[PDB]
Amino acid sequence: RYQSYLEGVKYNVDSAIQTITKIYNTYTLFSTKLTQMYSTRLDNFAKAKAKEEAAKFTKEDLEKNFKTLLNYIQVSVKTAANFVYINDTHAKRKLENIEAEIKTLIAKIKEQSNLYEAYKAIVTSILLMRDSLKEVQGIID
């Protein structure tokens, strides 16, 4: 009963952590394509392929990943609202703080026309958020 709440929060927090890693790995890959397409060491064929690849990253994909992240945390918060003990109510409080931050990041992404700039606006925040979510996992398990 109460165990299924703890299990549900653990699953959704783990999925949120994975989603952040997916977003950060996308940023890393995007960055390398932008570097490659202006590189002086690469030939024209290779730079052209890198320019094509840099153009295939979408704001839609970033926004989808952020909606996936928000949804995992929102389920975590709804489930954690059933927590009653001193340590797991603290986990619930951290998750609500993280939910609010995710909404702020989704708003920041909207106000950036340039996709790389949108990633740059959120990378520090999501890296810190992943660490905070790792703390949450320890607080309850």
Author numbering: 208 to 348
Article passage:
B. burgdorferi BBK32 is a surface-exposed lipoprotein with multiple roles in vertebrate host interactions. While the interaction of BBK32 with fibronectin and glycosaminoglycans is formed by non-overlapping binding sites in the intrinsically disordered N-terminal region of BBK32 (BBK32-N), the globular C-terminal region of BBK32 (BBK32-C) is now known to bind specifically to the initiating protease of the classical complement pathway, C1r. In fact, there are relatively few examples of pathogenic strategies which specifically target the classical pathway and BBK32 is the only known inhibitor which directly blocks the initiator protease C1r.
Importantly, the BBK32(206–348) construct retained full C1-binding, C1r-binding and complement inhibitory activities. BBK32(206–348) crystals grew in space group P65 with one molecule per asymmetric unit and diffracted to 1.7 Å resolution. Starting from the N-terminus, helix α1 (residues Ser-211 to Met-245) interacts with helices α3 (Lys- 256 to Ala-286), α4 (Ile-293 to Lys-317), and α5 (Leu-323 to Ile-347) to form an anti-parallel four-helix bundle. In the BBK32-C structure E308 is a surface exposed residue located midway through α4, while Q319 and E324 are in the short loop connecting α4 and α5. Q319 and E324 are also surface exposed and together present a contiguous surface region.
